[PDB]
Write a protein that binds this ligand. Structure first.
Ligand SMILES: *[C@@H]1O[C@H](CO)[C@@H](O)[C@H](O)[C@H]1NC(C)=O
Ligand SMILES: *[C@@H]1O[C@H](CO)[C@@H](O)[C@H](O)[C@H]1NC(C)=O
Ligand SMILES: *[C@@H]1O[C@H](CO)[C@@H](O)[C@H](O)[C@H]1NC(C)=O
Ligand SMILES: *[C@@H]1O[C@H](CO)[C@@H](O)[C@H](O)[C@H]1NC(C)=O
Ligand SMILES: *[C@@H]1O[C@H](CO)[C@@H](O)[C@H](O)[C@H]1NC(C)=O
Ligand SMILES: *[C@@H]1O[C@H](CO)[C@@H](O)[C@H](O)[C@H]1NC(C)=O
Ligand SMILES: *[C@@H]1O[C@H](CO)[C@@H](O)[C@H](O)[C@H]1NC(C)=O
Ligand SMILES: *[C@@H]1O[C@H](CO)[C@@H](O)[C@H](O)[C@H]1NC(C)=O
Ligand SMILES: *[C@@H]1O[C@H](CO)[C@@H](O)[C@H](O)[C@H]1NC(C)=O
Ligand SMILES: *[C@@H]1O[C@H](CO)[C@@H](O)[C@H](O)[C@H]1NC(C)=O
Lengths: 358, 358
């Protein structure tokens, strides 16, 4: 049976840093291979024709069936899988690597579906030209996707391949299609990132043109495949009037606490409640918290991690359809304000191993 | 006969633009007398020897006993009265005018107390050296108050004058003392104004030093006079741990909607309820919403003004101790996004005359 996001609930994890690369997730990897680049675009440029061999090794080794077993043992029922657009289309001007990403995606998705009946969200984390001027959108400094009909068409070509991957998977009912991640056209000053000010009405109109095109394409092939819309950092309420209630649509909200607020480990449940109570729409469409983590801006403490993770899970499940944590596997050693490093707050496998869900 | 802000409830108004001047409140005044200045400081500098005569005329005519009768007829029971520090002390390095402000304040306050038993909040809206780089803090570009013992000392001199006014008033039980308004040390980029990022922890420590000194000074003379702490745009929770619950303290929160969010006239009650639910503290101390107004960032409509004012009044008096609208009398004709001008959304006497409170 296909899922109805209005009645489905699940707690999940992101498989971040696996098919798309970021400096913070694995410090050893980045130090060894980036040449100091800020982005996956530059890491691949730095490696030159060794970019593919290095990345294929990481694809084959970072996330294996054993990771899926560990996640299932901790009660995970949803995997969100960020991918670069270059897994789906090979554009000669892109510096992102086009390889066997989807073969590893299929191996891990098949195992999670056939073994555990997990639900899989396929996220095209970047789109051609760049959606937010960050590494995750294509490359640092790239916002060329907006208002560009060539990049629009390439984005639809990418989505035609993701729909086909789902439709021919053997279990189309196991997947949700997420065609954009954190679009932003007003974040030259990063103080507005994570806020409604990251996306202007002009940018939002282009995003809406794209999501409407994706919805029409999915409906033309298989209307039972849900579309997960990551509406930047606008409240879901902002987009509600743009879609009829009959659309097979779920919103993906992202909630973080690690900068730009007076959060602490002590008060983190108050900030999580605020986000759940104020940023979950009116109920017109369902909401899933597709990314979050417990790192606070100030005064991180190690002893409140279990309390904070469990408070977040219960909050997202109470005000929305559940959540997926960023991220499954994280070894980055960037210092946090207070106790420890990012790997102590951002690695979901560590929480499982330390018995937070027993 | 003194009030306990934990039990007291009241709906009030600000008498803004009366004893402190701002460009938006009265366009004819500003266009005639400012010479293009951004601030009261520069308006007074431009007028030179005519500054006093021009301001004394406004003091005597803008707010009269007739205004108090109209406000009372609309159910007003609290007056918040913004003053410049120059009402209280005459510093030789200040371009703000020192005249008969407190004589006009006493005529109106005494009338309001004797006739209607209104409660009076005396607000020192500016302090020597400037508390937020804005005209309201002293002058555009002035942040000199922070970490400066000269300005600290003359601030305490201002507070001694306000305490003496209250104690010699003939009704000390009728007054709350508010010794600062919207301090901000991190608003050189005004995108952070209205948010917690407008005040750094370093600036917040200086504000705390000052409020602790004011609380001690009032406790030393008449501990039954409440102190109203306007803690910038931090959540009240930020400051709660800094005072014992026995402190005769109330927080003043300021909630506005006219920039930096996806607010509309249609959705304004959602934004009002979000502020009340998340920005009212934990209950350790009482909260009063000392400034608010109904102008939204987008799609202002005149038709929803009554619904929006009543929604806000009801929300602030349920989740806190009430509110005071900005402002009693407003003729500024700056355009808003949507229909109308600022005078349609910022003039409380207009709401009374349209029968909103009948
Ligand atoms: C962080 O990881 C990098 C790369 O492995 C390593 O060079 C560095 O010494 C680490 N720092 C600490 C303090 O562990
Ligand atoms: C892609 O996978 C195929 C089949 O397993 C393999 O033959 C080939 O070497 C892989 N290509 C790269 C670029 O690693
Ligand atoms: C859109 O992107 C294409 C591919 O880079 C580029 O050649 C073109 O100049 C851009 N068009 C506009 C409208 O800027
Ligand atoms: C985009 O794709 C459509 C449909 O195939 C085509 O009609 C259109 O001309 C293309 N536009 C560009 C800029 O390539
Ligand atoms: C864009 O961001 C700037 C801050 O860099 C902000 O001042 C401005 O209001 C934002 N514009 C929109 C439409 O969000
Ligand atoms: C605003 O009022 C000023 C001062 O009376 C007047 O000169 C100006 O034309 C008005 N602007 C309008 C009505 O928008
Ligand atoms: C202040 O009020 C007093 C008493 O009515 C009056 O004598 C004086 O002229 C006024 N001062 C100024 C500077 O207008
Ligand atoms: C405080 O600041 C003013 C400038 O606003 C300066 O004249 C004064 O010397 C400073 N006082 C101290 C004690 O630094
Ligand atoms: C502030 O007043 C205190 C107490 O009278 C005095 O000791 C000090 O020197 C004054 N500081 C300045 C900078 O005027
Ligand atoms: C100060 O404001 C800037 C934006 O202009 C923001 O980037 C920064 O985080 C703020 N700092 C603090 C300590 O609030």
């Amino acid at each position: 049976s296909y899922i109805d996001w209005r009645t489905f609930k699940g707690n999940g994890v992101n498989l971040g840093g696996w098919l798309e690369q970021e400096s913070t997730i694995d410090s050893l990897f980045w130090d060894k291979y980036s040449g100091g680049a800020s982005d996956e675009w530059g890491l691949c440029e730095h490696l030159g024709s060794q970019c593919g061999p290095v990345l294929e090794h990481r694809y084959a080794t970072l996330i294996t069936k054993a990771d899926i077993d560990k996640l299932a043992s901790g009660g995970i029922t949803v995997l969100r899988i960020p991918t670069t657009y270059a897994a789906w289309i090979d554009l000669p001007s892109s510096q992102l690597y086009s390889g066997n990403q989807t073969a590893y995606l299929k191996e891990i998705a098949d195992y999670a579906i056939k073994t555990y009946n997990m639900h899989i969200i396929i996220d095209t984390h970047s789109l051609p030209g760049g959606v937010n001027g960050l590494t995750i959108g294509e490359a640092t400094g790239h916002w060329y996707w907006f208002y560009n009909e060539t990049h629009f068409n390439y984005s639809m070509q990418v989505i035609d391949q993701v729909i086909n991957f789902i439709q021919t998977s053997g279990s189309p009912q196991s997947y949700t299609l997420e065609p954009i991640n954190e679009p932003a056209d007003n974040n030259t000053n990063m103080v507005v990132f994570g806020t409604p000010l990251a996306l202007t009405d002009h940018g939002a109109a282009w995003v809406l043109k794209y999501i409407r095109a994706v919805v029409q394409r999915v409906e033309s092939v298989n209307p039972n495949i849900p579309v997960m819309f990551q509406g930047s950092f606008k409240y879901p309420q902002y987009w509600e009037g743009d879609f009829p209630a009959s659309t097979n649509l779920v919103f993906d909200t992202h909630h973080y606490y690690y900068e730009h607020m007076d959060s602490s480990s002590e008060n983190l449940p108050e900030y999580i409640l605020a986000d759940a109570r104020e940023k979950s729409g009116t109920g017109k469409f369902p909401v899933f918290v597709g990314e979050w983590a417990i790192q606070a801006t100030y005064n991180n403490t190690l002893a409140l991690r279990k309390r904070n993770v469990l408070a977040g899970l219960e909050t997202w499940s109470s005000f929305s359809q559940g959540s997926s944590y960023w991220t499954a596997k994280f070894t980055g050693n960037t210092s946090v304000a207070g106790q420890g490093e990012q790997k102590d707050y951002w690695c979901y496998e560590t929480f499982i191993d330390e018995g937070y869900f027993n």
